Ligand binder design. Structure first.
Ligand SMILES: C[S@@+](CC[C@H](N)C(=O)[O-])C[C@H]1O[C@@H](n2cnc3c(N)ncnc32)[C@H](O)[C@@H]1O
Ligand SMILES: [Zn+2]
Lengths: 134, 191
């Protein structure tokens, strides 16, 4: 499961719908096994399209939980189009690509900060099935 | 439960299945009329036949939801770029508000009329599906579903549920004079 996905995946239990703490989930840096995957080609257009939606505080939180505190405290900003990108912009987009698209959790677990429900990741795939009463 | 390792493999490995799923996915994408490099939810992604096409045709990044472990396990060997998630769409779409540019679903949502897996009404699951889908889409996000209705009451129940959830749009029916080859597409947009 890609790091990017951690920036959008919330708790599945219905009761947690209106809770500030259904997102981000709380990733267990003890259990989570990371993989880096160069197969996904650098895609600056996608990054420009997703960056406004990205929740930077939740990026920092999950990164810290996963061992990485080397990130800037504020969300990178960019011009509105590919053709206005500078060499510096491009360097920063490359790092975002690596962080968000090329890094994934292969095995691990994460929990809802609000209800405590635990989810498991196996073979890069999160199990989001819930028991009937939730 | 419906699939198993044997049947998931025979489905995903059938050339006739591959060709038809590919055609309807391409048609769904045509109806979605997206900008390239968008962020997409693929609902009922199975083994990723529809998802591969999102990757190749529009350069899209996508997440796939499916309730079947053997379908997903089959997807794992196909070199997909999407994130696969074991999930029951009738329980809701578990992403924060405004996550996705669009959602797509090929041959999957008619299962929401089925009352086997869980003990909520299909009526309730249907509503849970569309209300949470509406929320997880950006404002003006689109949803196109190719689906197989059993009868016109299923169609109008699906349309009604999508309507009450906030969606607008309609039904596209390709080759409708051939009930061997006709195909229904739900084509929606959010507010
Ligand atoms: C005929 S397959 C289509 C798969 C893929 N979209 C394609 O074009 O090949 C229908 C899929 O919907 C899935 N499905 C059925 N009910 C579901 C549910 N409640 N939530 C998520 N997926 C479901 C099945 O597991 C199956 O993979
Ligand atoms: Zn929760």
């Amino acid at each position: 499961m890609k790091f990017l996905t951690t920036n959008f995946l919330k708790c599945s239990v219905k009761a947690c719908d209106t809770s500030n703490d259904n997102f981000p989930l709380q990733y267990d840096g003890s259990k989570c096994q990371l993989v880096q995957d160069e197969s996904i080609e650098f895609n600056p257009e996608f990054l420009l399209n997703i960056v406004d939606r990205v929740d930077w505080p939740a990026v920092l939180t999950v990164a810290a939980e996963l061992g990485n505190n080397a990130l800037p405290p504020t969300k990178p900003s960019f011009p509105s189009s590919i053709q206005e990108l500078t060499d510096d912009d491009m360097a920063i987009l490359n790092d975002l690509h690596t962080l968000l698209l090329q890094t994934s959790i292969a095995e691990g677990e994460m929990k809802c900060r609000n209800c405590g429900h635990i989810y498991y990741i196996k073979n890069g795939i999160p199990n989001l099935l819930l028991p009937p009463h939730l | 439960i419906f699939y198993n390792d044997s049947e998931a493999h025979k489905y995903t490995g059938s050339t006739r299945v591959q060709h038809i799923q590919a055609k309807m996915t391409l048609r769904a994408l045509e109806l979605l009329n997206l900008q390239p490099c968008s962020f997409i939810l693929d609902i009922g992604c199975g083994s990723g036949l529809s998802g591969e096409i999102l990757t190749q045709e529009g350069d899209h990044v996508w997440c796939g939801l499916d309730i079947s472990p053997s379908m997903l396990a089959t997807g794992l060997s196909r070199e997909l770029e999407g994130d696969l998630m074991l999930q029951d769409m009738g329980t809701g779409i578990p992403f924060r508000a405004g996550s996705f540019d669009a959602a797509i679903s090929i041959s999957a949502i008619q299962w929401l009329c089925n009352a086997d897996t869980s003990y909520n009404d299909p009526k309730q699951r249907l509503m849970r599906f569309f209300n949470t889908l509406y929320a997880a889409l950006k404002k003006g996000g689109k949803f196109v579903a190719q689906f197989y209705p059993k009868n016109d009451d299923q169609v109008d129940d699906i349309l009604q549920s999508a309507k009450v959830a906030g969606f607008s749009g309609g039904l596209v029916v390709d080759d409708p004079e051939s009930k061997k080859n006709k195909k229904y597409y739900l084509v929606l947009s959010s507010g």
